[PDB]
Design a binder for these strands. Structure first.
Ligand code: MG
Ligand code: MG
Ligand code: MG
Ligand code: MG
Ligand code: MG
Ligand code: MG
Ligand code: MG
Ligand code: MG
Ligand code: MG
Ligand code: MG
Ligand code: MG
Ligand code: MG
Ligand code: MG
Ligand code: MG
Ligand code: MG
Ligand code: MG
Ligand code: MG
Ligand code: MG
Ligand code: MG
Ligand code: MG
Ligand code: MG
Ligand code: MG
Ligand code: MG
Ligand code: MG
Ligand code: MG
Ligand code: MG
Ligand code: MG
Ligand code: MG
Ligand code: MG
Ligand code: MG
Ligand code: MG
Ligand code: MG
Ligand code: MG
Ligand code: MG
Ligand code: MG
Ligand code: MG
Ligand code: MG
Ligand code: MG
Ligand code: MG
Ligand code: MG
Ligand code: MG
Ligand code: MG
Ligand code: MG
Ligand code: MG
Ligand code: MG
Ligand code: MG
Ligand code: MG
Ligand code: MG
Ligand code: MG
Ligand code: MG
Ligand code: MG
Lengths: 227, 95, 122, 46
RNA sequence: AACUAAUCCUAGCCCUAGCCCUACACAAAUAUAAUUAUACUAUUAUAUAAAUCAAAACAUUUAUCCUACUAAAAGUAUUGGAGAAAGAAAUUCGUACAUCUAGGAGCUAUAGAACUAGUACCGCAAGGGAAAGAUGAAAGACUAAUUAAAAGUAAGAACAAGCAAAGAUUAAACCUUGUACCUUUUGCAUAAUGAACUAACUAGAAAACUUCUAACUAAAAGAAUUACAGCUAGAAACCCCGAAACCAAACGAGCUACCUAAAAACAAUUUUAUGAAUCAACUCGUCUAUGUGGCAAAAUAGUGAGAAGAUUUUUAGGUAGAGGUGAAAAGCCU
RNA sequence: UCUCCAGGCAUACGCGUAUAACAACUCGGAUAACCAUUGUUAGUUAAUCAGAAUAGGCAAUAAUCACACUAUAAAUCACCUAUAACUUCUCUGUUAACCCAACACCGGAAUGCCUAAAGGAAAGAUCCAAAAAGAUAAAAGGAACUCGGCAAACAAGAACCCCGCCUGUUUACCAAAAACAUCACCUCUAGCAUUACAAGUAUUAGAGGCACUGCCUGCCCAGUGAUCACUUGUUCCUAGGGACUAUGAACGGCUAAACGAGGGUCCAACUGUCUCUUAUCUUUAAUCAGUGAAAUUGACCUUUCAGUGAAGAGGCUGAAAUAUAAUAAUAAGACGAGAAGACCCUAUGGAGCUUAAAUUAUAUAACUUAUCUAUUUUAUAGUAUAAGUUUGAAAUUUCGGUUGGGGUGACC
């Protein structure tokens, strides 16, 4: 009888009502522990393909205007409503975004290095080595999946041929095609890790239930005696 | 053992008896000596001779073997050239 | 602790539970939560004029009851259809195609009162 | 606390948990009905 | 000189025989929270049975369960921790009572079906599941009688002294003699179990060998078997109630545990403005007394803890036993 | 009419005629009266209370008197474009002293309004015993009580040790705690999307441990000559010859406070806890009237002393005592009556748990060879399956015997 709430097909900026799980599945059994209750939250559909040219428009660099930088219940980072043409869409906001700012979204792969302005989306080929990036996408056109948490920045270590090495926030090095799109700068809420929950009740507000109260090398035969 | 079998409603023979003992028609049972094929290298010659012999069974043992076999094994068999032909009968037995 | 043997009716259960007592619907509930009664859906009693009618509820005990002969298809056919066909056969003006002339109905569709499936109540 | 009052009547729960439509929804439930029909029960379900 | 009671005979049932069936018996209503006259929202059994149990344990294995003509071959060949046990076939025999709807060294109200009924009642559900009736030809003859008759009482309390009686006696009691029953314990009861009393019900069952009684007899037996007096037939035999468990399939989250959705409640007083303070409603249950077949299968009366929060509470939904849930008490899941 | 008591009226859920009148007086109410019982007849009235056309486009801006403000946990069809239709009231709920608790149960039971204008009766009659329960009062004393100031008090103040950071949570029905959780801190696992984690992405998520705070200790990280030379180290080629090096583990003592129906202790006050008990009132008791259970029970015409005997005798031996029956009290005995109590031993009886027990183990996870595909000049890759190998999620079964209580050694 469990139907997922993720049943909306059309992108909108209207907040969407979310149903909580509690850690259960469609079967109805707990699959993950520590999830329950919390404050009621609304989902704001984020757009992780920064370079999405508007409908009935050419695939060339375009600009968008930042309406407001909001607080997101569903994320550690903060989101920004950005407007361009006749379209509004939520996006992830970088460290220094402000209302009224203008951000570029470019398809052009610069033969030479492109000056890096935080918040603008360029193909990794355009960027020069060493520039901090966020909201990287593993495959061209896939959509951002990495470095989209609060304060996380990835360095662009190297570019050779049509491939670049991206150092993920965990220091795990990844490689992608330079056609892949990344957003310059680190993600907002750079001080998210400095927060102090302070009391147990605050965690219960965040939908986190308390942990359970419950409290292996095998020697080889030569070593079994000497264990 | 089985006194009344499910399919035929009869007594059943214990085949382990049929595989170790010979019944003479007079009522006697024959057997071998336990261990007659075991560790012969450390047995005395007289001991080995005693082991090789065929030996009779007691009245109680004979009574038990009679219970554990059916009447088919107690019948007269007229085998041509039988080597036990003479031992199916008792002679000069007063008792 | 519930009663399993008594009938399930609208008096029982919560307010949300409702069901009919067997009355035929006389209208439709449209959108906006409005009942719209349909005049055609409301049964109309066809009552005859009883002035000058000689039949009363009971009969004389001296009135002879007749021999019981339930009506059959053959009995109806002989009384109504047989004389016409017999007369036409003697004149020779009879054919299979024109059975409708004598009262046959090829189909019940288009009739206000259909014999099968019946489309009128008693 | 005092026990014995575990029945907290609710007609919606009763018909949904033990009703005709509930019993016919699964083959195991249909077999429940068949058993009660063979015994001759006056009440096949709630 | 009689109350409570007792007596009763047929309602039906049991097992066979025979036989395929074709019954599918107004209108209307019902798969929706069944029995609600019409659209919303699609509709669909299961992969091999397991275990208990036997093997005096248990681990391969364990007849029927899990069916393919009777009798014989035969408990033979074969199979088997070659143990417990299991166990053919080839091949012989068989026209089965025939006809029509019959039969009982079967039961007779604690029996025979659970049945007067799958009802009443019990359970949320799956499911479990009773008890009983009695006149005569006529009741359009006032409902029949019959029986020192069970225990229990009454008619009619008792009268130094004793397992309650026995020997007696003119005499009921006095005198004399006398350590209840069953079961066990060592053959011992002042032991220890079991019994308020009445009525009904309530527990030894099989034929291998042996014995007895007969038929015929080097043969016996109504086919298949035994036989160096045997063979054939008869008669003669081996209890009852009781676990914790184990497995399969259903039923359960109206209680409780946790969760999802939609809702609700929180006065007054202070405060650095809050999982702060005081203290109601409300929630909980510290300590004591009462209660201990209670008002209650966990309460009452006081006294206490929290009381804007990790609070409490309502409605509907969800997770199911090889499982679920658990701020882990191995706690909770009627 | 009087005396006194202080949760009432509605709705929801549930219940199903218990509603009302009459007639009955069998059954039901634990007794009467009267009916909540039996029979018959009646009843609850709604367009407002309550229940029960289609296709497109589209949304940044809480609530709290919403203004000022502050905040964080981030918080509810409409409107528009077209299409279609172009006058309607039927159906259902409505009674009650009621539901879940086997009961006319001192229990459980949501919301709105109100706190007496609504709703009710603690005493069937009598008596004033013991014991038992509850309330009040106390001369002098004031913890001398007791395991303990338990309980009570004209008191309800102060302080310190141990434990846990704190508010929370837990063994429904014997444990509320020092246990569990908890912020904080630490360890381990994971680089990724269309059903949980999550419409999330290393400042994230999951698994688990652990008080934090500040303060200490310091496993450790080749040597020797100094970014530098040789000896080492590790590999090879043969003892020679090359090749190559390139803060912090483990821990502790305590922020040090605050808080606690936690466990100990002390002082003050207070007292019937006590020296040492008493009086009064109520409940119960007892007599009268009505109704009427339970465990229990071999039979009893049911004595004392000494002996006997299993620590043991109303019943046996020997002495003794002895008109018969009730009513009210006591609890020495009847190994007094009831419980799923306690302790030990047994069974080739169970079950839960743990492993390093034996047997298995297409749960996963790897691999190898086939098979099947593609490619490939034999190589690669893969893989609806089969056979192996490695892991083990699980499954099944077992707990020999002699050994005061064990430990141990032993023994058969
Ligand atoms: Mg823990
Ligand atoms: Mg119950
Ligand atoms: Mg409830
Ligand atoms: Mg066994
Ligand atoms: Mg055993
Ligand atoms: Mg066993
Ligand atoms: Mg087995
Ligand atoms: Mg009967
Ligand atoms: Mg019966
Ligand atoms: Mg009598
Ligand atoms: Mg006497
Ligand atoms: Mg005993
Ligand atoms: Mg629930
Ligand atoms: Mg308040
Ligand atoms: Mg507080
Ligand atoms: Mg308080
Ligand atoms: Mg407090
Ligand atoms: Mg909990
Ligand atoms: Mg524990
Ligand atoms: Mg424990
Ligand atoms: Mg009256
Ligand atoms: Mg009465
Ligand atoms: Mg009344
Ligand atoms: Mg009445
Ligand atoms: Mg009313
Ligand atoms: Mg009760
Ligand atoms: Mg009043
Ligand atoms: Mg009184
Ligand atoms: Mg006082
Ligand atoms: Mg005083
Ligand atoms: Mg003292
Ligand atoms: Mg003292
Ligand atoms: Mg006290
Ligand atoms: Mg604590
Ligand atoms: Mg606390
Ligand atoms: Mg509790
Ligand atoms: Mg408890
Ligand atoms: Mg406490
Ligand atoms: Mg307690
Ligand atoms: Mg702890
Ligand atoms: Mg405490
Ligand atoms: Mg003092
Ligand atoms: Mg009386
Ligand atoms: Mg007497
Ligand atoms: Mg006497
Ligand atoms: Mg004595
Ligand atoms: Mg005596
Ligand atoms: Mg007395
Ligand atoms: Mg006594
Ligand atoms: Mg006793
Ligand atoms: Mg033994």
């Amino acid at each position: 009888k469990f139907v997922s709430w993720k049943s909306r097909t059309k992108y909108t900026v209207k907040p969407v009502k979310m149903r909580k799980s509690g850690g259960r599945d469609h079967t109805g059994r707990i699959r993950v522990h520590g999830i329950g209750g919390g404050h009621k939250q609304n989902y704001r559909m984020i757009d992780f393909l920064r370079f999405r040219p508007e409908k009935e428009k050419a695939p060339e660099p375009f600009e968008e205007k930042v309406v407001v930088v909001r607080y997101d219940p569903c994320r550690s980072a903060d989101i920004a409503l950005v407007a361009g043409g006749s379209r509004k869409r939520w996006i992830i906001a970088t460290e220094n975004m402000k209302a009224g700012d203008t951000i570029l979204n470019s398809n052009h792969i610069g033969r030479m290095a492109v000056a890096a302005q935080e918040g603008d989306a360029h193909p990794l080929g355009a960027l020069p080595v060493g520039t901090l990036i966020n909201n990287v996408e593993s495959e061209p056109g896939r959509g951002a999946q990495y470095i989209r948490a609060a304060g996380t920045c990835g360095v662009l270590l190297r570019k050779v041929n049509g491939t670049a090495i991206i150092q993920l926030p965990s220091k795990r090095q990844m490689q992608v095609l330079e056609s892949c799109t990344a957003t310059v700068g680190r993600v907002s809420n750079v001080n998210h890790n400095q927060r102090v929950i302070g009391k147990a009740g605050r965690n219960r507000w965040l939908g986190k239930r308390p942990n359970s109260g419950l409290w292996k090398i095998r020697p080889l035969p030569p070593m079994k005696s000497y264990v | 053992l089985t006194y009344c079998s499910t399919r035929k409603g009869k007594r059943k023979t214990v085949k382990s008896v049929v595989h170790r003992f010979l019944r003479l028609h007079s009522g006697l049972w024959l057997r071998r000596k336990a261990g007659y094929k075991k560790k012969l290298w450390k047995k005395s010659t007289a001991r080995k001779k005693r082991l090789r012999e065929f030996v009779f069974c007691s009245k109680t043992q004979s009574k038990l073997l009679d219970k554990m076999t059916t009447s088919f094994w107690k019948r007269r068999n007229w085998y041509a050239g039988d080597p036990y032909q003479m031992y199916h009968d008792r002679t000069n037995l007063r008792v | 602790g519930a009663d399993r043997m008594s009938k399930w009716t609208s008096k029982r259960g919560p307010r949300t539970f409702t069901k009919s007592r067997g009355a035929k619907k006389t209208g439709i509930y449209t959108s906006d939560r409005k009942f719209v009664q349909i005049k055609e859906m409301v049964p109309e009693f066809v009552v005859p004029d009883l002035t000058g009618f000689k039949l009363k509820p009971y009969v004389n005990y001296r009135a002879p009851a007749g021999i019981d002969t339930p009506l059959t298809a053959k009995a109806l056919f002989q009384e109504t259809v047989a004389p016409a066909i017999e007369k036409d056969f003697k004149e020779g003006t009879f054919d299979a195609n024109n059975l409708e002339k004598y009262g046959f109905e090829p189909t019940q569709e288009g009739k206000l009162f259909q014999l099968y499936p019946k489309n009128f109540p008693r | 606390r005092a026990r014995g009052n575990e029945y907290q009547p609710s007609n919606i729960k009763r018909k949904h948990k033990h009703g005709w439509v509930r019993r016919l929804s699964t083959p195991a439930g249909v077999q429940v009905i068949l058993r009660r029909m063979l015994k001759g029960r006056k009440s096949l379900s709630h």
